[PDB]
Amino acid sequence: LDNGLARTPTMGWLHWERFMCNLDCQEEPDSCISEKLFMEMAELMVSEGWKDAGYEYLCIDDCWMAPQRDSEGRLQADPQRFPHGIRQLANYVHSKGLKLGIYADVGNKTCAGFPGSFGYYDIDAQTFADWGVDLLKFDGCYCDSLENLADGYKHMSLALNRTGRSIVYSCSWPAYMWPFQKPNYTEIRQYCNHWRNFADIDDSWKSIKSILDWTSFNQERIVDVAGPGGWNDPDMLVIGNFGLSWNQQVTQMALWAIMAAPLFMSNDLRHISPQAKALLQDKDVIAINQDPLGKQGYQLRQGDNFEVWERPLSGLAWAVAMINRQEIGGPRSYTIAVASLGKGVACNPACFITQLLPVKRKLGFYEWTSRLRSHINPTGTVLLQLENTMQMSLK
């Protein structure tokens, strides 16, 4: 989308996976969806260095709204869970140097059952612009036809544009087209900053794999459309929660960087392990994600329960991810000829290889004819940065 936004993938925090549609502030004041929840996250996004790592969008997902529009036809913040309304909350966030994200639906209702924006796109756009919203996740639920789907999405895109305010526009458009409807990514790209392609993530290795596989399987179709201002969204980072082994967390962090995915953490910033924080704030990995060339990576090859993914980076450098998919035994030795990497350019005449995950370690120079041996934990990933020796010498 040509709104000057999301020149690199958008980073931030989104409540959904972690917190869902929890409306019980009486029994569960600390994890029901409320202005309090977001304010707490906002403080911690600053105090815990999340803002500095690049996480800047604090995003409200579904179930922030009251059950109907006000007498002027505007969506309303739930009166008991957002007593000071969205404006004040946006103000709060802005005072922190962060930006605010919000959630709406293209159809008659949000997925949770709250007011959809169908028939209110302009009102809703204007409402969001005025509150000072900076990002909108626009979901596909409760849409009667694909014609409508496509229209609503395009309409909201213009409606937002017309408000004159910069708002990152996130469209679940393509996801609601799958499996039998080949979405037009050229068209989607034009209206959206990023787009959800596939099913909702959750706190499981199953789900991660499902996403990785769906992505690689569908790669020719989607990798090349992605770039500055328009990204493929494989959903929230779920690192730091409950259902992932450490190795699996690493794999997500690694692969989301390779895939140039937006980085929306969904977790409790109040209770997050020093490791998780370290991984999610990993500055070399984040740099790979945020590489300014903005070229999404791909699966290079797979077999014997290994996968190799690689991503071209600015400076003719390359990210390389090696995933051990075998879920039994111990660290498994993997060997690849550096010649195969970076379509044979990465390491010609040589390349310097730095390992980034699971730990940062310099591995030195590999001539183009040489082989790289790794040991990769079951469900883990080794992330690598290749520096071509030629470009290195150049200052």
Added chain:
Amino acid sequence: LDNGLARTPTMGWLHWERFMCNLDCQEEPDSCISEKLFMEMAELMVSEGWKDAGYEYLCIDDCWMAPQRDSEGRLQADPQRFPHGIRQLANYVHSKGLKLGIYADVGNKTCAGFPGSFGYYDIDAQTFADWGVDLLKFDGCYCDSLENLADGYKHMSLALNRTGRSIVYSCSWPAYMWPFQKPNYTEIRQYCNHWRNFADIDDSWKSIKSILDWTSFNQERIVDVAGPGGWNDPDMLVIGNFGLSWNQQVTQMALWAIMAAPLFMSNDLRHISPQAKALLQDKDVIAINQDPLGKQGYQLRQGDNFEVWERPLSGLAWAVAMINRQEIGGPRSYTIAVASLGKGVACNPACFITQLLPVKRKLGFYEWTSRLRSHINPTGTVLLQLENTMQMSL
């Protein structure tokens, strides 16, 4: 099996899940299957308090043997990887106060492709007993028929008995039956100390769940056959490895205790996190597993992605496990009437409830009529001990 063994579920360590059939000692001397591997584990089983927690069987799984029987038709330790042979290794293990487990197969070949025991049951039983083996895992691979399967298993059972040596006998009999037909556990129980029911575990939550679910589904046929001298084997504890979140590890430790499963860790004792160690050596949980009454627990109820399991313990006590099966969101609140627990006796008139996992914490006295509220992490488990208050009078 009436050999006086496994009066409580057998505890120990088994190489397979962690180490598999790794035959490359040249490229991987520290994790190929060798006498060195087992000796290291044996020292650590002592030095790291594993023996004291109750882990006493050091077990060799598949790929210890050479590719043929010697001229006397005996199974042989791989000459390169077990240069001093099994005898010396058993001696070593015994000197530590530990016992040795070994692996054979009822068919023509072990699963990995090495010599099976079909046609050599007596020879093999005698070979093991000679060496000083104390436990045999007997696998089901490469068997032509179920008739044979059943026979080989019964034969090895007697063959072992005839050697006169105490050997825990572990049979994968029922697991290789389930594909073809319903296994007779009365029969199995007669010949075996424990038995693998299900598919192989691995380093995944997917696999644990599949095991828990398969068991709960089939609990009618299997829970009651289990008892002193004869146990259901839901396979190795994989805690402390790579593919499980902490909550999932907790769930395995909890549920294997509820299930009165044998406890065979499969991990690297050389590199195991303080936490894993602590969980696996958790002495209140191990006590529940090792409860002398030897009654296996069961799933009590399930729904809304919660499961409640419970197990009767001696002293009219009860273990209760609550599993949060919902794999999205955060800790989820669960509430049960203590009246439902322990077929309405556990808490009548009252019970004192101790939480054991994820952390140990005294919850207090609960009347018959009261409700217990918990918060359980996604894929986690809360493990509970209930003491009936009448018993704390006495």
